[PDB]
Amino acid sequence: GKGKPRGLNSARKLRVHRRNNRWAENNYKKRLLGTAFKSSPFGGSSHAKGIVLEKLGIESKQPNSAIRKCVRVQLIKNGKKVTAFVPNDGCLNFVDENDEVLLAGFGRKGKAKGDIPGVRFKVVKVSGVSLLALWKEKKEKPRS
Amino acid sequence: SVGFGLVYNSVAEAKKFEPTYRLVRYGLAEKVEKASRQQRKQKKNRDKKIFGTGKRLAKKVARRNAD
Amino acid sequence: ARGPKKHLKRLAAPHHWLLDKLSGCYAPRPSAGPHKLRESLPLIVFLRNRLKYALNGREVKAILMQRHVKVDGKVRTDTTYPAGFMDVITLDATNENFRLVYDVKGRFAVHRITDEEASYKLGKVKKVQLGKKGVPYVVTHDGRTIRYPDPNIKVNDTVKIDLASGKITDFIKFDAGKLVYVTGGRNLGRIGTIVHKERHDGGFDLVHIKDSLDNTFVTRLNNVFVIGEQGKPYISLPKGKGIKLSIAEERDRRRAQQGL
Amino acid sequence: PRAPRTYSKTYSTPKRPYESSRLDAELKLAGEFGLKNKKEIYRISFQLSKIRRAARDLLTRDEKDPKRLFEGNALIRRLVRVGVLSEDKKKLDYVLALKVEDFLERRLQTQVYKLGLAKSVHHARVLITQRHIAVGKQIVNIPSFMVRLDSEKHIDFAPTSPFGGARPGRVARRNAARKAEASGE
Amino acid sequence: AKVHGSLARAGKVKSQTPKVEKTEKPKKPKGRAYKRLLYTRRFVNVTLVNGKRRMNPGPSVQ
RNA sequence: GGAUAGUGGCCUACCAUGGUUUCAACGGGUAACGGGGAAUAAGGGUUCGAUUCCGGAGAGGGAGCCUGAGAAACGGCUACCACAUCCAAGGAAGGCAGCAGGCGCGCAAAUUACCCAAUCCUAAUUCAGGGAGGUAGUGACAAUAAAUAACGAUACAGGGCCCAUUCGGGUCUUGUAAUUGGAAUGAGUACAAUGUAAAUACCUUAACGAGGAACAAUUGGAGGGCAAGUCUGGUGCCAGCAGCCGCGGUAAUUCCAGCUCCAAUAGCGUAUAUUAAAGUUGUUGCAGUUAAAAAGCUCGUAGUUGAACUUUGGGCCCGGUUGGCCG
RNA sequence: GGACUUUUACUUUGAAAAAAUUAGAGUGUUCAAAGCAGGCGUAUUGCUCGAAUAUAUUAGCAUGGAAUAAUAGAAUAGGACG
């Protein structure tokens, strides 16, 4: 019964057949195709710093309704064009075109967060300085 | 306060066997006024560019600039 | 690695020296000599780690440079000279005669023998060869070669050497019963008779052993060092006679000897 | 190329961050033994676990096991020498029922209090960490000391510090000195 | 979908919440002192109740 | 046979056609140096290992070689290749994956500091030399210890057991303070001595160093999961929040703030990876009529697997161990 | 009395076996992480215990076992034993 070999000598089959099924698992397969190195905008890196190209007013999905304040960024190490979300009340005024900004993920491990569509990254620093310091008026955006 | 101590059998027999850094604490030895390592080294390399006495070399150099 | 190595990282050294972990990156590293560097004992480790007669490694040399120390009678001056098993070491300027001989753990115990006895040692023969010009010779475990030996002397048999003339003065054969010292392995430091030698063609003869307590342990022929007759040592054994006790029996002997 | 001067950590945060039940009990403890934070309980909660594990494993073995007896009685003899295990509860079965406050009680902190000297653990806190203590000749300014049996009859004030003789403190000495240069001359 | 919406009111509300400065107060005790404060308060004297006891009730029911 | 220090298709002549493979050869990929080990704690496992030790390899890329016991060596040479320095324009010279230090790369990593006192190495050698190594500087990588207050006085409320007919009340001990009281201590500052090769910090110690605008603790959160507000003000499907469910369309417990409260605390949050949770990779240990999934069917090789029986039973010896009991 | 499985797998116990790491014994770094120290005394020319133990699940080697599971042997007798 049970539909799998039980023999004392069936170790190869058991070993290989699990090797064969480990592919139906995302994280595994994601780890062996080296997708983070290849497809992902960061190189699998946790952060990446790019240059701001334009501001976006992205409308959120249903059943929400607002304008979701983001920027298009060209990652330095790639040249990759990625769009990231500037968080908190009016922080989009802290960032400007050709600024350079630190981007990070959204803790969704690839996926987009909340209701903002196609935006899988968030702005953490602009022009060397953190936002939750600019926002809190602890420091000021260096006059460039 | 716990420390360590030594009692040699005669002064100069301590003179001998004592690390010279201790003796200078005791006014038992004089401080060698020496060139810093880098300065010592930079000389070892400067002299190294010379083969022989140098006193020949100085004649070599000086004859040139007196015509 | 392009040639012979000259350093010893302090961690790759033999544990049975008991050097500390910290306090430096390197260990002494035995020079080339009588004993295999892993099976040896530098004079620096004896004279400051095992006797505390020195502190600095500098003061080790200053003692040696004073010729203050003989090994096997010859005055040795190399800081990291590789002394070993059955060696003597004689600090004359203080009337001390030792003999590097094993602990009951696997270490080199500070064994003090008399001002006599230091006039000889023992030697396990390693090979017995016909040299050139027909001369025969034996080779002992400390790189001693003695030409013209007793024809009876075969390999593994020990040999009573003097210490200012070479020369064998009686010896012991390897048969059942003899009193044996284990010189390495899991039983290093132990002493016992024989019972059996289990020979194996191809390689590796094991030698079953029994001590003075009816505990039977086994090692490899390589590690066995005959030193005389049953209950009759040809030298002075260290304290405990290399009998070995359990951690249990250890602990009892401690707390009992402890107090009063 | 040196030797990796080894180390390890002492505590162990709880698997579930917000248990109103657990969080209550932890706070009760922090107040009666007069602790500083939750880490000082995590430290002891963790210590306790290995002990119970060490004993959890030894008990599975056949009795009169050469290793069980040595490593057990050695465990028991230590636990008793500090005042956490009862003098005649010397069995591994009784160490698995051991709980946090047993350990927590034996701190210098709750000894300076538990025999005069303090009349408050929070008083006892500041007394220890201000040199006003001496397990014999030795000052001990760590609240988490751990007082051993035959050491219990030695916990007293310092040969230094006003509460032990030789000079009063430097605030007293500034008061009896300001009534001097003034009301005197 | 639509990516070009209005950036006009970037922070409409933070910029119109009437700044009211923080009313000062005595500093609360740090370290052990604070936990002592919490042991005594929360369960030695026992104040406000309901058959459940309550941490932060605003102006009760009455 | 030659060659090598030597074995050997290592090379060469001649001779045969052999050698590996579904028990995976051969080829491909690796963001691959191997191991000692590391992270994760029911067990089994999963993931990781450039990096304190061992082995290997390399010194911008390749090849060649001199010297020597040992090097196919690079702080040796020779050449080609890729760089690239000085120049009186004829020429000459350099290989930091040594230690510092710079440019570049980037999310990402410190001083062009002192010394051979220690640890050990080397030479003709106690003595010289050693950016090995040690020492300090930068250093919230990790890890340990754990200050930011302690105790009283008094005025009310009373935990007040009572006495007890009533503003009648014993009497400690909780809690409240725009009320006061003296005690304590190091964080620092600093004579000295200690420490050190010298200086530095630790340890020790004169003189100092505690009353609130200080010696003033932070970080996140308060709908649910999940511990803690249906309080106040602002906004009005806007701004924003929200890992997930969701909040916001004028009484918002969820945004922006004030106040209060909760949680960890000299540390707390975020992102990325990974482990546990996951019996959602299942050997242990999953699922497959209808939720994902039995090849249309039979045959059949490799694979896995494969009925029963052969000295069973009887009877002794010897010397062991926990418990009866008892001192 | 030494050698001795037809040919094996399996299982027992040992041997050769780096240190560090891990587990874990002792030790009052003032506690602890550590470290491998140290402890006693006439402390004016001394004494003394230490620096354990366990782990390696592959393979090789040595060894006690013969249940389970494989394997060889006499059929035209080209059989065994002396």
Swiss-Prot record, chain A:
The keyword Ribonucleoprotein applies. Changing P63A: Lethal mutation. Component of the small ribosomal subunit (SSU). Mature yeast ribosomes consist of a small (40S) and a large (60S) subunit. The 40S small subunit contains 1 molecule of ribosomal RNA (18S rRNA) and 33 different proteins (encoded by 57 genes). The large 60S subunit contains 3 rRNA molecules (25S, 5.8S and 5S rRNA) and 46 different proteins (encoded by 81 genes). It is found in: Cytoplasm. Present with 10600 molecules/cell in log phase SD medium. There are 2 genes for uS12 in yeast. Pfam families: Ribosom_S12_S23 (PF00164). The modification 3,4-dihydroxyproline is found at P63. GO terms for cellular component: cytosol; cytosolic small ribosomal subunit; ribosome. SUPFAM superfamilies: Nucleic acid-binding proteins. This is Small ribosomal subunit protein uS12A. There is a cross-link at K55 (Glycyl lysine isopeptide (Lys-Gly) (interchain with G-Cter in ubiquitin)). CDD domains: Ribosomal_S23. Changing N64A: Lethal mutation. Keywords: Cytoplasm, Hydroxylation, Isopeptide bond, Ribonucleoprotein, Ribosomal protein, Ubl conjugation. Hydroxylation at Pro-63 affects translation termination efficiency. The stereochemistry of the 3,4-dihydroxyproline has not yet been determined. It comes from the Eukaryota. GO terms for biological process: maintenance of translational fidelity; maturation of SSU-rRNA from tricistronic rRNA transcript (SSU-rRNA, 5.8S rRNA, LSU-rRNA); regulation of translational fidelity; translation. The keyword Ribonucleoprotein applies.
From Swiss-Prot, chain C:
InterPro entries: KOW, Rib_uL2_dom2, Ribosomal_eS4, Ribosomal_eS4_C, Ribosomal_eS4_central_region, Ribosomal_eS4_central_sf, Ribosomal_eS4_KOW, Ribosomal_eS4_N. The modification Phosphothreonine is found at T114. Keywords: Cytoplasm, Isopeptide bond, Phosphoprotein, Ribonucleoprotein, Ribosomal protein, RNA-binding, rRNA-binding, Ubl conjugation. Pfam families: 40S_S4_C (PF16121), KOW (PF00467), Ribosomal_S4e (PF00900), RS4NT (PF08071), S4 (PF01479). There is a cross-link at K61, K133, K160, K167, K173, K178, K210, K232 (Glycyl lysine isopeptide (Lys-Gly) (interchain with G-Cter in ubiquitin)). GO terms for cellular component: 90S preribosome; cytoplasm; cytosol; cytosolic small ribosomal subunit. One of its GO terms (biological process) is translation. Gene3D superfamilies: 2.30.30.30, 2.40.50.740, RNA-binding S4 domain. It is found in: Cytoplasm. GO terms for molecular function: RNA binding; rRNA binding; structural constituent of ribosome. Its main location: cytoplasm. The modification Phosphoserine is found at S31, S246. The keyword Cell inner membrane does not apply. PANTHER family: 30S/40S RIBOSOMAL PROTEIN S4, SMALL RIBOSOMAL SUBUNIT PROTEIN ES4. Component of the small ribosomal subunit (SSU). Mature yeast ribosomes consist of a small (40S) and a large (60S) subunit. The 40S small subunit contains 1 molecule of ribosomal RNA (18S rRNA) and 33 different proteins (encoded by 57 genes). The large 60S subunit contains 3 rRNA molecules (25S, 5.8S and 5S rRNA) and 46 different proteins (encoded by 81 genes). Present with 573 molecules/cell in log phase SD medium. There are 2 genes for eS4 in yeast. Belongs to the eukaryotic ribosomal protein eS4 family. This is Small ribosomal subunit protein eS4A.
From Swiss-Prot, chain D:
Pfam families: Ribosomal_S4 (PF00163), S4 (PF01479). GO terms for molecular function: rRNA binding; structural constituent of ribosome. Keywords: Cytoplasm, Isopeptide bond, Nucleus, Phosphoprotein, Ribonucleoprotein, Ribosomal protein, Ribosome biogenesis, RNA-binding, rRNA processing, rRNA-binding, Ubl conjugation. GO terms for cellular component: 90S preribosome; cytoplasm; cytosol; cytosolic small ribosomal subunit; nucleolus; nucleoplasm; small-subunit processome. It is found in: Cytoplasm; Nucleus, Nucleolus. CDD domains: S4. Residues 106-180 form the S4 RNA-binding domain. NCBIfam families: PRK04051.1, uS4_arch. Component of the ribosome, a large ribonucleoprotein complex responsible for the synthesis of proteins in the cell. The small ribosomal subunit (SSU) binds messenger RNAs (mRNAs) and translates the encoded message by selecting cognate aminoacyl-transfer RNA (tRNA) molecules. The large subunit (LSU) contains the ribosomal catalytic site termed the peptidyl transferase center (PTC), which catalyzes the formation of peptide bonds, thereby polymerizing the amino acids delivered by tRNAs into a polypeptide chain. Belongs to the universal ribosomal protein uS4 family. This is Small ribosomal subunit protein uS4A. It comes from Saccharomyces cerevisiae (strain ATCC 204508 / S288c) (Baker's yeast).
From Swiss-Prot, chain E:
It is found in: Cytoplasm. One of its GO terms (cellular component) is cytoplasmic stress granule. The modification Phosphoserine is found at S15. The keyword Phosphoprotein applies. Signal peptide: none annotated. Residues 1-34 are annotated as: Disordered. GO terms for biological process: cytoplasmic translation. InterPro entries: Ribosomal_eS30. The modification Phosphothreonine is found at T47. It comes from the Eukaryota. Component of the small ribosomal subunit (SSU). Mature yeast ribosomes consist of a small (40S) and a large (60S) subunit. The 40S small subunit contains 1 molecule of ribosomal RNA (18S rRNA) and 33 different proteins (encoded by 57 genes). The large 60S subunit contains 3 rRNA molecules (25S, 5.8S and 5S rRNA) and 46 different proteins (encoded by 81 genes). Component of the ribosome, a large ribonucleoprotein complex responsible for the synthesis of proteins in the cell. The small ribosomal subunit (SSU) binds messenger RNAs (mRNAs) and translates the encoded message by selecting cognate aminoacyl-transfer RNA (tRNA) molecules. The large subunit (LSU) contains the ribosomal catalytic site termed the peptidyl transferase center (PTC), which catalyzes the formation of peptide bonds, thereby polymerizing the amino acids delivered by tRNAs into a polypeptide chain. Present with 37600 molecules/cell in log phase SD medium. This is Small ribosomal subunit protein eS30A. It comes from Saccharomyces cerevisiae (strain ATCC 204508 / S288c) (Baker's yeast).
